[PDB]
Design a binder for this molecule. Sequence first.
Ligand SMILES: *c1cc(=O)[nH]c(=O)n1[C@@H]1O[C@H](COP(=O)(O)O)[C@@H](O)[C@H]1O
Ligand SMILES: *c1cc(=O)[nH]c(=O)n1[C@@H]1O[C@H](COP(=O)(O)O)[C@@H](O)[C@H]1O
Lengths: 329, 322
Amino acid sequence: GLVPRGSMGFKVKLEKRRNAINTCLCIGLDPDEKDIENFMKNEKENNYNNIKKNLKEKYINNVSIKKDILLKAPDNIIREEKSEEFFYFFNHFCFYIINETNKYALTFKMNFAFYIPYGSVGIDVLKNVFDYLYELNIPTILDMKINDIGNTVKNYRKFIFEYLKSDSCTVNIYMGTNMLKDICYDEEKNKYYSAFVLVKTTNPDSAIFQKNLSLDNKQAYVIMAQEALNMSSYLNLEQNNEFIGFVVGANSYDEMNYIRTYFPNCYILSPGIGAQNGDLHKTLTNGYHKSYEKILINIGRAITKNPYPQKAAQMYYDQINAILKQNME
Amino acid sequence: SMGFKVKLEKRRNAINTCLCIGLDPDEKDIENFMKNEKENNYNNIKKNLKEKYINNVSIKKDILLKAPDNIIREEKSEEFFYFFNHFCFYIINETNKYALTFKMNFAFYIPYGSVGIDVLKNVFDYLYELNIPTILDMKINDIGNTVKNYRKFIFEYLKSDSCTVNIYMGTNMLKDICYDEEKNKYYSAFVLVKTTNPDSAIFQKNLSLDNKQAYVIMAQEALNMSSYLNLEQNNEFIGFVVGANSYDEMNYIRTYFPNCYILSPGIGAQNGDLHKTLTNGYHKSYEKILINIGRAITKNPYPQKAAQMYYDQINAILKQNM
Ligand SMILES: *c1cc(=O)[nH]c(=O)n1[C@@H]1O[C@H](COP(=O)(O)O)[C@@H](O)[C@H]1O
Ligand SMILES: *c1cc(=O)[nH]c(=O)n1[C@@H]1O[C@H](COP(=O)(O)O)[C@@H](O)[C@H]1O
């Protein structure tokens, strides 16, 4: 009755991890330029103690890109490999955050926009980040909020699900729900994949379209949720241990309550705690499911911009679990 | 320096068209170019290597300048990079004289990992040296702090003139895409209004507010943001993506937003009707109606002739409209 890692659908992988670790913390890894620079400065000042720790981990030997560089001595990089210095410290920052926080994480979410602004270099880092997480067997989301016509979105499907080997991604279906057939399904290989569609977002004017637009007396966010679920049904995702879930922001308490009430077994991804000031008690109570992999609480900057990310992650893990315990009593 | 609004007007005066050429190479296009080049003594690569502005690309120029016979023997790990970049250069060299603008969809450049992002960079470098206005098609959407990374990639790293944006998440994202407060810089974007996909009516038409369909609400909110940001005073604008196949919407948008910039994909591969699209979306400053053609040019085995014919027919239709 045993399945090897990589050989099961996201639904099963998430359920096993939640059973093991007893949380719904999703740790966001969105490293900005200041983060990377700060890491390099701190490492330079302390003889690279965190990099030396990364270098001890076995799975670092199993990453795809420029392992020759990543495994070098840090002082060798700086003196002899100056054109690789940014690559090195960028990739070592992510490995550091992952090494420090992974024991608390149901899943990691990496937002693509943080890995693209330097050109090809960050995309090598991103690939290595997905390879590393694959080796540790931690569930992954690529947050890229993709949208386009079907012929074009197949390319993202290939990047996200074949090249990165991500378990899931985020998608904006405003263009049309039919794009999902080219994202959550590969007709050539007969493979199924999971995604979270945008339902209610955390930006301060999210209401302008998601709530102001309606059809009869349902607001756009409700219609969009229903359409996404209808597509999941058509594609038979849940039969292949995959799903289409919902992004619902951690500050949209009324919408969270509605979505959970009206779609009782939906998978919800909820960003907005920490940096965006969302209310964790309210969000987690309104989105609660007894299978709490169905209510992922994403925390990015509040962990990654803390000088002690392991302790910041532990604190959120403990705070989530305390609220989970109340909901379970 | 000058501003996209001024860039477009001035290129329009020089070349007299509103053709926007879509550069979206898929794996099979790249493989076919490599197969054909081999069989025809690399005649197109050798033509590429004759061009002036190849000596100005940012990334691995050394490699791109090598003879293809030598790449395949001594730089084999660079073979895909080499042929991908040369395919893009070949299309640009063959078609640029007909193009008001080039639009590169990001999705085609990402799925092999970093290698295609180096190609994309060199593509934008090459177009920049040719002073051709550019659009990065990425249909971006996120919260403000995140989308700033896209502003940097698109407008600082690629030095693109504009991009496509989906504002369904909210309109305030545009303050961190089209404006850089720190640097006092302003940039142009086209927002999705009516898309070409078959089921585009589901949210864009069947949702409404007041007695206006969603697509109208969206266009108006985008123009309000343009005003807020003072883009037009900085020679930049927020324009609209309106499907070539959406004649009523095009009609509505041109009538009710008389001086708006429209980018219209969906002719060729997606079957739209050039004559109706151009008539319905027409403006005498025809840079305000960009007709995008990607696959109908790039998947044509005679891409120079294909661009020429769209140019010619666009011009005959523009002449008819006066
Ligand atoms: C996406 C959608 C949304 O509605 N809100 C969001 O914040 N996001 C993305 O989630 C992440 C939040 O991280 P942080 O505020 O905890 O740092 C970030 O990737 C954003 O793009
Ligand atoms: C974006 C939005 C839209 O509504 N329709 C679209 O087709 N697109 C993009 O535009 C290009 C169309 O190219 P082609 O059909 O002429 O090849 C493509 O980049 C698609 O992503």
